[PDB]
Design a protein around this ligand. Structure first.
Ligand SMILES: C=C(/N=C/c1c(COP(=O)(O)O)cnc(C)c1O)C(=O)O
Ligand SMILES: c1ccc2[nH]cnc2c1
Ligand SMILES: c1ccc2[nH]cnc2c1
Ligand SMILES: c1ccc2[nH]cnc2c1
Ligand SMILES: [Cl-]
Ligand SMILES: [Cl-]
Ligand SMILES: [Cl-]
Ligand SMILES: [Cs+]
Ligand SMILES: [Cs+]
Lengths: 253, 394
């Protein structure tokens, strides 16, 4: 499919930034996770970034470490995550869906097989947190064979060879983190940039778009609202709706 | 792009978030530079000799082999300053940290031997040291904790996941992402992302080099086999490296069998796990059918790890090295036998290697064989553990 291209074309028509929340699949349980995700979309999420619970999430701070433990405490498995993703896609035909994976869950049952399952349930992209561009070839090839965008992080300690590699190898969007990074990435015809460095306020979304980013990725801020409101499901959904409404409003201008 | 090959056949690599790649590239160039620098080599040799006490003895064990055609030598890494082989490569890595202009050290430990070695090296060389350790591990290793703090190190317990060595490993990489301009990550085994498996081997290879010189002096020939326990792989690759091209010399690595391979409570991923990607490397893992990393088990904290260094996976694949397992009960018997018949108290980790040598002898007592066991550490740290088992069974 072309869900990221269509979304950016529609947003560029509207002179509008993307707002993309991150949540852990099955946090705090399968049914509540599905309700949380439907609430983010209803409230104006342009796209989703969805974590699969992993035993040793070495790229995650404590907010998301705790999100995975909550999901394991509910028995959430990779197979249950693929069932959830098929249900989300069945409800929501156009929203780009990206996964945040750890390499072992992609490699476990065979890399080709992993990306074939992603394509069957209608996932758009995969970011493998512990596969740098230097190790990426078999992952990026299997992704593209199954119409999945491989997503790369352009860190702040990036150099020009890394910018050319991320620009050539990535698809869908470039995960960002002087921010002239954005102009070089455009010069190198990179996938549109989403800024993802601790985006937790409306002003940061506006600022990302003003810098020339196509939008912003939150994540942690969303999981924090889940953590805070465990004891009140309907207050959780109210605070999630208000947060996403505010972050999405910030992207129109 | 790298200066050296990050792979041993299909095993190894650099499976880290993009943000850590510059730290690994910087470390590789500093290592390649240091290995060509006679002043670096001279400073390293000085510390090994005059501070750590190298060369270590090679002890012939006559009582334990009486009435068989086995001749057994022990390579006495137990006599190194700190009481384990871990000291050798901590001294080299601390000098690399200084070469790179770093002022701070991060280290993981399970048992506490690498943490003690990192804290002693940091005290000597004027580095500020922090040690991530399983909260489970902290609560079981209060001796080695107190030693680290006496030597001015910060010991950080880990609440994350199973709260153990893999999470301790997990915690250390977590920290280095942000601090690598100022801090060096002092990885304690021949595993993790390139260039650590290579660096740790080269900073442990004096074990095998000395063993080869000493066995030529004493016996006028190479050993039939050298035998070492395998937790992550550093003492074994240190003993193996200088013999890899001596194709007559057997290389035997001993993984922990725990309660028995058939129980699933073991630490033997090389022979009983399957390949995965974790801790920065493609290597054999103990993992669930779903690809979650499993918890290992051994009576010996220093072997209790669900992966293995990629060079051991490679040496196994091509048949250059053979890997076996030894259970808790076999290790304990070898521990008691060495104490009673040679007056040496071995680390329970090292007792795995000894137990396999004793099996080689006892199974085939009229086979002529010249064996060396790497005695990776002393067993003072294990006497409470052994006491507690002996009380329980009698
Ligand atoms: C894991 C640790 N110890 C490992 C160890 C081992 C196993 O690690 P290597 O496979 O890296 O040699 C062997 N012998 C001794 C005396 C040891 O202390 C540690 O000290 O943190
Ligand atoms: C979203 C959530 C967790 C992540 N870990 C690394 N990149 C991420 C993006
Ligand atoms: C692969 C193999 C050998 C190498 N030497 C330097 N970089 C390498 C990568
Ligand atoms: C295996 C894994 C990590 C280690 N750190 C120190 N010794 C080790 C053995
Ligand atoms: Cl726009
Ligand atoms: Cl592109
Ligand atoms: Cl010589
Ligand atoms: Cs003998
Ligand atoms: Cs092991």
């Amino acid at each position: 499919m072309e869900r990221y291209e269509n979304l950016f074309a529609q947003l560029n028509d509207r002179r509008e930034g993307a707002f993309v929340p991150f949540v852990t699949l099955g946090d705090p349980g399968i049914e509540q996770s599905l309700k949380i995700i439907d609430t983010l979309i209803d409230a104006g999420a342009d796209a989703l970034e969805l974590g699969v619970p992993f035993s040793d999430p070495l790229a995650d701070g404590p907010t998301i470490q705790n999100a995975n433990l909550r999901a394991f405490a509910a028995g959430v498995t990779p197979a249950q995550c693929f069932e959830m993703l098929a249900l989300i896609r069945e409800k929501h035909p156009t929203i780009p869906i990206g996964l945040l994976m750890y390499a072992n869950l992609v490699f476990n049952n065979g890399i080709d097989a992993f990306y074939a399952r992603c394509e069957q349930v209608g996932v758009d992209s995969v970011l493998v947190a512990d596969v740098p561009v230097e190790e990426s070839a078999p992952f990026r090839q299997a992704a593209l064979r199954h119409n999945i965008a491989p997503i790369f992080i352009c860190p702040p300690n990036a150099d020009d060879d890394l910018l050319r590699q991320v620009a050539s190898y990535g698809r869908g969007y470039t995960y960002l983190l002087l921010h002239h990074l954005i102009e070089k990435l455009k010069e190198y015809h990179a996938a549109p940039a989403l800024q993802g460095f601790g985006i937790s306020s409306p002003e940061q979304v506006s600022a990302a778009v003003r810098a020339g980013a196509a939008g912003a990725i939150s994540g942690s801020a969303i999981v924090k609202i889940i953590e805070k409101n465990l004891a009140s499901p309907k207050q959780m959904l109210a605070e999630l709706r208000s947060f996403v409404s505010a972050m999405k409003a910030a992207s129109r201008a | 792009t790298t200066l050296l090959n990050p792979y041993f056949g299909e095993f190894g690599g650099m499976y880290v978030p993009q943000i850590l790649m510059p730290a690994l590239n910087q470390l590789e160039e500093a290592f390649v530079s240091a290995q060509k620098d006679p002043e670096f080599q001279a400073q390293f040799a000085d510390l090994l000799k005059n501070y750590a006490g190298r060369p270590t003895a090679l002890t012939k064990c006559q009582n334990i082999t009486a009435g068989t055609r086995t001749t057994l030598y022990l390579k006495r890494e137990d006599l190194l300053h700190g009481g384990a082989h871990k000291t050798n490569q901590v001294l080299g890595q601390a000098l690399l940290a200084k070469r790179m202009g770093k002022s701070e050290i991060i280290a993981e430990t399970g048992a506490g031997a690498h943490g003690v070695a990192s804290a002693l090296a940091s005290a000597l060389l004027g580095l500020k040291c922090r040690i991530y350790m399983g909260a489970k591990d902290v609560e079981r290793q209060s001796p080695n904790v107190f030693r680290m703090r006496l030597m001015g190190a910060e010991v950080i317990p880990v609440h994350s996941g199973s709260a153990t060595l893999k999470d301790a490993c997990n915690e250390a990489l977590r920290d280095w992402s942000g601090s690598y301009e100022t801090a060096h990550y002092m990885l304690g085994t021949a595993a993790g992302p390139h260039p650590y498996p290579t660096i740790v081997r080269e900073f442990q290879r004096m074990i095998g080099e000395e063993t080869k010189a000493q066995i030529l002096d004493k016996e006028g020939r190479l050993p039939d086999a050298v035998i070492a326990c395998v937790g992550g792989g550093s003492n074994a690759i240190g003993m193996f490296a200088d013999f890899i091209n001596d194709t007559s010399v057997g290389l035997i690595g001993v993984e922990p069998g725990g309660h028995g391979i058939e129980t699933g409570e073991h630490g033997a991923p090389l022979k009983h796990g399957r390949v995965g990607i974790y801790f920065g490397m493609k290597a054999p893992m103990m993992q669930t059918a779903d690809g979650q990393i499993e918890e290992s088990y051994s009576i010996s904290a220093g072997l209790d790890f669900p992966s293995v260094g990629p060079q051991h996976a490679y040496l196994n694949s091509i048949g250059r090295a053979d890997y076996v397992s030894i259970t808790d009960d076999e290790a304990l018997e070898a521990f008691k036998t060495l104490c009673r018949h040679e007056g040496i108290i071995p680390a329970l980790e090292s007792s795995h290697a000894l137990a396999h040598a004793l099996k080689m002898m006892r199974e085939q007592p009229e086979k002529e064989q010249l064996l060396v066991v790497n005695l990776s550490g002393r067993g003072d740290k294990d006497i409470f553990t052994v006491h507690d088992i002996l009380k329980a069974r009698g």
